[PDB]
Each structure stands twice: as C-alpha cells, then as structure tokens.
Design a protein around this ligand. Structure first.
Ligand SMILES: *C(=O)CCCC[C@@H]1SC[C@@H]2NC(=O)N[C@@H]21
Ligand SMILES: *C(=O)CCCC[C@@H]1SC[C@@H]2NC(=O)N[C@@H]21
Lengths: 226, 542, 163, 175, 88, 29
C-alpha cells in the first residue's frame, strides 16, 4: 500500500507491471521502495511492513535478504561499515523455514485451483490426491484425502493437518481468496496464486512461494533404441 | 377477503408456507429413532470398513502381491484410476464388493476388476481396469460378469470405454463357467465390436499381460496403447509355443511393445511407463470429436434439501424382525430432493405407492416409492405415472421397499394380477432412463413391479439394510412350515430357524453385491449424490 | 483375413451364413505374432459380430479357445447353434490342456505326472462332451449328422419372417 | 393463449354464468377452434371445466356431426397421443358427454365443493332406478379422488386449483 | 446464424514462424531429390505446434495425427517418403 | 520418487515440457 499511511509515507518506483517479463543481464533492479518516518527506527519498521506486503510471484528476488538485513542487530544499531554484507553473510543468508501448515495450505489451494464446479465423490471412500513440492531440492510430497464436505486432510511425517474450505472467490488478478478453518479451531482467510510451476500463499504469517516439482523434459522419450 | 393472493406467491414462498415442501423433522428424542440411528451407523461403518480393507488389503498375501506389483514399476488399480481421471472430479465405482465370499478359499477383491464412470477432459467415460494383484488378474466368472455389466452400461449410455488391461486370462479351473456361453468371455468382444460399430469409442491400454482370448481386447479396440516393459500381447503364450514347436521365447520377444508397435501394428501408441500410458489415454480421449453439450442450457439454479440426510437412518426400522414396522417414505424423499419439494401425483388414491415429481440438482425426475402393500389401485397408479413420465421423457426413480401384493379371494377376483401386469408392462416398455434403489425389502413379484434387476434400469443400488429374496424370511418360514406336512411338530422351530437363517444370509446386501445383482451398496446419506452422478451418466444417451 | 472378407461379402448381399466349427486354435509362434495374427483374428471376430445377416453354426468337430470366438460361437449371437454327438467344446483341447498344465505346474513331481494328465484329460472330456454342453443350454440341441441338412432348412425358414 | 411458468399454453375455460355453462353450437365451435390452434401449434391445453353440458334445445346442432361435441374428445385423445399435454381442472360441474373431458386428460384436478363428475346426473339416476342422490355423493371430489381414481389432484378451492394447475404445468419436461 | 452457439475459440498460434517453412523445402526438380521431415511444416501450421501422432513407429513414411486449426480439430495425413504396405 | 505427477500436469505445461509439441527450430545458418 503506497501513499501516506497512518504514521509513515511509502513510495514505490518500478519500471515493471504485472505480466511483464524481466530479462536477465538487462536492468536487474525490479523496483525501489522508500519509506519516510520521523525516526530511523520508525522508518525501518515501515520498510519492514511494506516489504512484507510486496508479493512477487514468477521471479526470484531478495525480499528475504532485505528482511534479514533490516532485522540484523548490527544494522539496527546504527551506521555500519561497507563490508557489512560480507561480515554477516552466514547470518543474512539464513534459510527461511517452511512450517507444515504452509505446505498443507499450498496443497489445498492447488487442489482447489484444479477443481472447477465438479463435486468430489467416490462412494464409500475419501478422494485421494497428491501434490509434490521442492523444498531445498528435496521432493516433498503431500498426500491429501478430501471428502464431499470440502474438508481436506494432509499427511506429513507423524503429522496430520485438517483444512476446511468454507468458500473461495476468484479475484480479477488471476488469484483466489480462500476462507479456511485449519484443524478445527483456526479460522482465517488468505490469498493464493497458482501457476504451472509454483504456488504462492499470503498467510497472516507472511508470504510464501513453494515450487512444484519440475516436470521431466524427456517424458515418454523413445529414441528408436536404448 | 376472499381470493386475495396469486398462486405464484405460494409458488415462490419461504419453506414454512410453500405448499409442495415436505415437512418431516427428525424426532431425535424418540428412543426408536436413536435405535434406528445406531443400527444404520453400524451398518454404514461396516460398509466403509469393507471398502477400506479392499482398497488397502488385509492379508499378508495381498501385501506380497502388491509388493510384487509395485516392484515391477506398476501402479495399483485405484491409483491408475486416480491418475487417469481429472484431478478433482467424481468417480462412480460400481461393484466395489463384488466377489465377496463368492468362491471359497479366494479373496477375490473387487471381483478382480475395477469398473467405474470417470471424467476425462470433462467427458464422462466408462473405465474398466484389471487388477493384476488378484490371482494375477485372471478372469473369474464374476470378473466376466462385471466386465459385461460395465460394457452394458457404457453401451446403453454411449459412454466411451477405456480398458486398462493387465490379466493372465480366463482361469482354467472354472473354465466351464467362463469360456462357453452367451454371457461369457466372448461376449466382451461381441460388445466391443458392436459398440465400435455404433460410434462409441473403445480404447485399450495394455499395462500388463493379455493372453489368448484377452489378446482380442487390444486388437478389437479403435485405439490401443501398450507399455514397454510390462505390456505383452499374444494369442499363444510361451508355454504353448514351447509345447507346440519346442522353442523357448520370452514374453517380451514374443508379444512385447516393440513387436506390436513397430512391426505387427496391433498397437498404436508406445508407452514408456504407466504414467506415460495414462497420459496417452487422456490424449486419445481429448481427440474424440464429441460435442461438449447438445444444448448449452445449464439450469443449475437449485436448492439443497432442507433436511439433513445424516438422519435418514432414524426413520429406517429393522428390516430383519418378526414384525416389521412401517414408515413414511416421504421422510426419506424430503432428505434427497431439491428444496424438499415434491409434487405428489395421486395423494389419495394409491396411499401405498407414492408417485410424484422432484428435482435432483435441477434435473426433473419422477419418483415411485413403496409405502406399504401393493394393491390394484396402487399398481394402476404406478402404471399411469410411469406412462405419464414416459410421454414426457422424464427419468424414473424407484425406491423399493416391497413385501408383495395383497392376497385374498376378493383381490384376485378384482383383477390384481391384471393391474400388476399393467404396472410391469409400463415399467418394461418405457424408454426413459430408470434408476432403482432398494431402501427396504424387495420380495417376489412386487420386485418385478418396481423395476428390479431383470427390467433393465440404468443403475441399481442397495442400502446396507436392504434385503432381496423371492419372499420374506418370516413369510418363507411360515409358508414352508405350513406346506411341509412331512415335518413333525417336534421339529418345527428348528426348521423355521434354519430357513430364516438361510434367507437372511442369501438376502443380505453383501450377498447380492458379490453376485453383481446390483451396482453396489451405498450409504443412505450418499444416496442423493449417487443419483446425481447416475443421472449425469444418462445425459449422453440417445 | 479370408473369413473376414467372406463374411463382409455375404453381409453386403444379405446372404445368411453357415459356420461349421472344427477348430483347435490359431497358429502359435514368434513369426506369426509378429505378422499380426491377433489383428487378423480380431478382424474376423469383428466381421462376425457386427453383421446383421442370420447366422447358423454347427459344431461338427472341436471348438477350442479364441478360434471358437472367430467361428461364431455362442457368445456372438447366431440364430441357432447345434452340436454333433462327437463334438467337444472347451477353453482348450484335452491333450493341450494336459500338456500345458503339466508343463506350467512346477510344484508337480515327476512321480505324479501321468495321474495329473489323466485326471485333467478326464475332466476336460467330461465337461466338453455334447451332453454336458446341451444340459447347460450352451447350444440349441444335439443333432445327428445325417439330419443336419434338414435341421438347417428348418432354421433358415424360421429366419424368413425376420425384419 | 397465456403464459404459465414462461411456457405458452392454450386455456379453455367454461363460463358458468352463461346459461349455466351449457354448450351452444357456437360454444362447441369455439372450443374446437381453440383445440385446433393448440394442436397445430403444439400448445398444451388447459380446460377449466364448469358446464352443465350440451343444451337439449339445440341438440341437433350440437350432438351429432363430425364438427360437434364428440370432436372435442377426438381432438383431446389425438393431441394426447402426439405428446401435447391435456390438463383438466374441474371448477364446477361436468355432466354426460362433458364428463369425458376430465377423464380423457393426462392429468385432472377437481375442486371439493363445486366439482362434480358423472356420466349420469341425479335426475337420470332417479328416473332410472328411483334413487335420490346429491351431486356431491354421486360424483363429488371425494369419490373421484379417493375411490374412483378419475381425478389426480384434490383442490380445496379455486385458488388451490389454479395453483395445482401451475404445478402441473411446471412439471412438463418441455425445453 | 449457427446450429451450435458454442464458440471454442481458445486457441494458441503456432509456436514457429511460417515464414521459414521454405527453408525446409528442398528443390523438387533435381536429379536426386532430398528428403525432409514434414513435421517441421506441421509445426508451423497447427495451433500451439501440438500434434498427436497416430502410429509413430509403424508407418514411418506416412505421418498421421490429430491437430487443430484455430480450435477446429483436424486429422492430418502427410507423406514422409515412399508408400509401403504398412503406410497404406 | 516414482510416479509423482499427474498426466494433466504434462497436458497443461509450457512448450518446453509439453510432450505433444513439435520442436523443429530453423537451422538458419
Ligand atoms: C408371514 O410372514 C406370512 C404372512 C403373509 C405375508 C404378506 S401377505 C400380503 C403380502 N404379500 C406377500 O407376498 N407377502 C405379504
Ligand atoms: C498338445 O496337445 C499341445 C500342442 C499345441 C496345440 C496346438 S498349437 C497350434 C494350435 N493352437 C492352439 O491353441 N492349439 C493348437
């Protein structure tokens, strides 16, 4: 959200719109986001909030790196040396953890994207589905059993997550707003964007993008001999 | 003050005042209601447990067979169904519990074959997949019967057929009941050829082996797919060729994918694995030049039932009892049709056969349900209603809970046989789709009057409490005891108990299901859903 | 291929078909499967199944396996089907069944080979006899060879009122 | 020609305030013309029946001919055979020949108080057997809706009858 | 106007430029005529360059398959060499 | 690790991975 907010002023300057393709080795900068407050701490908090709300799907970015830099104690202390990036490389390049709730919600969102108006019904059975993501190069697989009441159960190692989808709404920006009840006691709404390669969820916890397991390029390859 | 309103106001009114809305609230505090609910819950739990043990396997032999199947790079039959159909779509598996306790010493899960109606590229198709983990996929008599039933449904509904073939062939132990007859293994090829002649597409995907007669399945299909490693097609197997010519050949070099895809020309698509085979099957389905819909009208402005189906079992009494209580079938109808709306046809004439109009997800359906003993008036009413629906091309839904007709000199003199014959003729000679569900008991000629299995309904399902027999168990016991004059007074109770036990055993839902007498057992709360799917399957019929 | 072409030729002319079955399966071997024998058998089966002319079949010899299917068996809707008293119908020949079952069954010991073959041959002879088939409505009766012509004529006349 | 549930139908209603609804020759001619239009346009027919019957004063011009009172039943049967729905609502009386109108329809409605259907009226039954019966106990809604089976829908009043007629029209499986 | 009001115009143009089709076409008038793959032509004519080949390994000189032109399904039979019995 | 995807994923895939797409780039040099 750009403009004059409650306590800070946010200004975003970009040369790209939704649907544009950024070509490598030509102007790598996606955008510049400036936040003005009354004190440095307030400006940093506003920048953190604005970066948390900047949702980009399709191109890898350094939003997590910027969040790590902003939350670094050395940066928040005051002025830092030029080699600061080289000084806290291990700390700033820390991997971002993905809880099982995010995996379950992403799988449910992907399945809802697959579903049109058809009813999930198998007599005397729960419909079985599977969604494969890549987490750190690891091919994680989420097995989901879905009932006719639009209630998904996703299975992880010694873990089960129950997600009841109350309603869905297709936003004009090719995205979907989904109201869910996680387990039986956590009701909230979120926004999901499903491509052919990744699933993005804007949860109250933040913004996550999970890459689907890439398809093989030699699927059904019969080169006359082996 | 008199005639102030307009009838359209009553037509569009809240459920409290709309006059064609059935009001049957559950008496949840009634002890009989709780007992009925507990019985229905136990029956449905048993049904789900049996289906689950079929899917997951129970014995260690099943585990070993599944391990062998997986180690060959093969998908399980239900997994093949899941990955062949559209990812989030319904699948109407028909004979889930076929072959249950049918052949002693064999756990013929699903009858060795899975048949269902799926959705591929938005088109409803009939899928028939062999289960290689059941005696190597060999065809039992029940397997042939189930395959023929699937072919019959597909032909009468013009559903394209997909055969996922992995089968050793007919089992030689029971070849007398498998090979020679009209309704035997060759009828599969007869049906396949006749369906292909009628423009109904036949697709075969050879995921495994097909030997001798089974080899006709890929060859007689419009398009066929064979998997490289596991796909073999030959009329004569390696044992036969060795016993004949004294030559040793592996199945791969005899009828493998290379020979049938590069030289023989029997197969049309070369599949590297099961996933590629299913992809090629979907690609074949995609290129059937079948129009999406004859009429683009949707008509999906429907309202769900106003009462929860989950309490239907509260109204269902114990069918197996010395004296069977009666209930109003409308309480069931109120929990199955759109908005619980029901226009009754002759509310005051039949009084034991409820005939009316309703809608399932916007689809208009005529409902004929039993509500007591059939009389001449009830049979006449049913025949007239069936004729009325036939003249309007309205599909018929029969809800069977019938214990025969009314007996007596007066009723026979009034021509009850003639009126029952009128009802039977009306049911038999109609051309509209017919769906029948056994909610109670189907006994004797009354079954015939209510669109039984012999009268060609599109689908027939039984609730777990249902019983089907030539006559009721108590009626059978009483009549057999009275007729048998040889029986001594000292041996009356034992004889009645024995005949009652036999009729209970042979009339149960599972006994009927294992013999393909119905198209599966479904829970009452799922009934509406099932009906909808069945109705949709009939939309492509001519 | 010849049978399929002939059946098509008769179907195009509304000429009724008469099948005389004495069949012991197809030719086995790598060369014959590579040549597409299954495809040609399928062509014959399709031609027999999809024709509309009246069909009458008589089992004069043996009807074994898929060859039966190619020769208008019971499953392919002939108007009438009769068997001679010497006829045998089975999924496979008795000698063929004995040999194949003995070769496949590796559990069977060498000491118990002749008894197993004799038992399976006796079972196939019993279940393949004309009377066994007739008692189960697998055919429309057993007729003597010398009456065959007469029977055919009657059957043909019965089809003259067909639409 | 009216519109019920968005479908065009042909409505034929007797006027009981014109000589008790008795059929003049012009009445028969107009009824036949309505039936002809409905049949050639495949419009479902709704007959709101309240008529004493053919008037005996001009029976020569009403009863016997091709284009006479029996042609109504001929047209009704032939339209029913062609799939064109015939609906009858007995708001009043139908005597003798008119009694065929509810009986030959695909679906029929009779109003409780005022609906009576009989081939022979109370005067005829008294002149024949010497018995006195009221029209209600002879051919009322109860006898024809609970025992006889001639009628299919029991209507409490005119408004309920019209509602049931609309319900019948709603369930014609016409695209 | 139309027997069926369905449109079905959700098609994708060919992924390769037709303007280079001539690059694949050899000189037909020559002492020895070179051979080319007709699929390279098909890829520049059908929707999304998609083509479901019917018997990819049997004919090998007659390419038979399914494709779409602006959403209209069409069966394509193209020559790819000398006709044999298998190709016919 | 074996049979992880669904065939519809390959059906709706970019041109690089969609298996029924003919790939005949021009050898312009
Ligand atoms: C005892 O169980 C036998 C009583 C008779 C059973 C009744 S008679 C009327 C119904 N018709 C029929 O066939 N059985 C029912
Ligand atoms: C011994 O009886 C077995 C020899 C093989 C029988 C032959 S091989 C060729 C024919 N086809 C067939 O099925 N059986 C016959």
């Amino acid at each position: 959200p750009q403009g004059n907010r409650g306590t800070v002023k946010v200004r975003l300057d970009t040369g790209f719109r939704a649907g544009d393709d950024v070509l490598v080795h030509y102007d790598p900068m996606i955008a510049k986001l400036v936040v003005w407050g009354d004190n440095r701490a307030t400006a940093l908090e506003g920048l953190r909030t604005a970066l948390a709300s900047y949702h980009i799907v399709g191109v890898e970015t350094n939003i997590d790196f910027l969040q790590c830099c902003l939350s670094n104690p050395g940066f928040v202390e005051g002025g830092v040396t030029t080699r600061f990036i080289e000084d806290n490389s291990v700390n700033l390049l820390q991997p971002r953890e993905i809880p099982n709730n995010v995996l379950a919600l992403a799988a449910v969102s992907y399945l809802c994207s697959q579903r049109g108006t058809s009813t999930l019904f198998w007599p005397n059975r729960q419909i079985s589905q599977g969604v494969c993501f890549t987490v750190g190069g690891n091919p994680v697989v989420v097995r989901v059993t879905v009932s006719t009441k639009m209630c998904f159960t996703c299975d992880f190692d010694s873990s089960s997550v129950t997600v009841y989808v109350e309603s869905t709404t297709n936003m004009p920006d090719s995205s979907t707003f989904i109201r869910v009840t996680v387990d039986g006691e956590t009701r909230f709404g979120f926004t999901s964007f499903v491509t052919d390669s990744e699933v993005a969820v804007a949860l109250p916890q933040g913004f996550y993008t999970l890459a689907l397991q890439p398809l093989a390029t030699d699927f059904g390859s019969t080169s006359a001999q082996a | 003050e008199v005639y102030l309103f307009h009838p359209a106001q009553y037509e569009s009114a809240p459920a409290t005042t709309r006059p064609n809305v059935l009001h049957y609230p559950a008496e949840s505090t009634n002890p009989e209601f709780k007992a009925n609910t507990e019985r229905m819950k136990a029956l449905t739990a048993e049904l789900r447990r049996r289906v689950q043990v079929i899917v997951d396997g129970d014995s260690e032999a099943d585990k070993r067979a599944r391990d062998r199947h997986i180690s060959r790079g093969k998908l399980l039959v239900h997994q093949r169904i899941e990955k062949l159909v559209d990812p989030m779509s319904p699948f109407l598996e028909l004979s889930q519990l076929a072959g249950g306790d049918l052949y002693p010493g064999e756990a013929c899960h699903r009858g060795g074959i899975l048949t269902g109606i799926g959705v591929v590229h938005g088109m409803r198709v009939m899928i028939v997949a062999n289960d290689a983990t059941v005696k190597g996929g060999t065809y039992y008599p029940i397997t042939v019967k189930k395959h023929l039933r699937a072919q019959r449904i597909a032909e009468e509904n013009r559903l394209p057929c997909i055969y996922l073939v992995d089968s050793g062939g007919a089992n030689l132990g029971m070849q007398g009941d498998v090979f020679p007859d009209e309704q035997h293994f060759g009828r599969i090829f007869f049906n396949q050829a006749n369906m292909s002649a009628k423009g109904i597409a036949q697709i075969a995907t050879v995921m495994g082996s097909c030997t001798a007669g089974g080899a006709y399945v890929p060859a007689m299909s419009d398009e066929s797919i064979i998997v490289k490693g596991n796909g073999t097609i030959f009329l004569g197997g390696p044992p036969l060729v060795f016993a004949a010519t004294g030559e040793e050949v592996t199945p791969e070099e005899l009828g493998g994918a290379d020979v049938h895809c590069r030289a023989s020309g029997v197969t049309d698509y070369f599949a590297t694995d099961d996933l590629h085979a299913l992809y090629l099957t979907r690609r074949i389905v995609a290129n059937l030049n079948r129009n999406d819909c004859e009429r683009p009208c949707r008509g999906r402005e429907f309202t769900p039932p106003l009462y929860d189906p989950s309490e239907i079992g509260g109204f269902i009494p114990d069918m197996g009892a010395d004296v069977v209580k009666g209930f109003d079938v409308r309480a069931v109808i109120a929990r199955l049709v759109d908005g619980s709306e029901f226009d009754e046809f002759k509310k005051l004439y039949g009084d034991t056969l409820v005939c009316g109009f309703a809608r399932f997800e916007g689809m208009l359906v005529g409902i004929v349900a039993n509500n007591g003993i059939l009389y001449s008036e009830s049979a006449l009413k049913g025949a007239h209603f069936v004729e009325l629906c036939s003249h309007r091309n309205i599909p018929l839904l029969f809800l069977q809970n019938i214990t025969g007709f009314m007996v007596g000199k007066t009723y026979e003199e009034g021509g009850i046989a003639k009126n029952g014959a009128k009802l039977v003729t009306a049911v038999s000679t109609t051309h509209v789709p017919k769906i029948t569900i056994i909610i109670g008991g189907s006994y004797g000629a009354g079954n015939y009057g209510m669109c039984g299995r012999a009268f060609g309904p599109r689908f027939l399902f039984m609730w777990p409490n249902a019983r089907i027999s030539v006559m009721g168990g108590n009626q059978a016991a009483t009549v057999l005891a009275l007729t048998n004059s040889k029986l001594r007074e000292n041996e009356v109770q034992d004889f009645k108990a024995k005949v009652r036990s036999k009729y209970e055993y042979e009339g149960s839902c599972y006994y009927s299901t294992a013999r393909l007498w119905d198209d599966g057992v479904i829970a009452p709360e799922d009934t509406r859903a099932v009906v909808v799917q069945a109705l949709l399957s009939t939309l492509s019929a001519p």
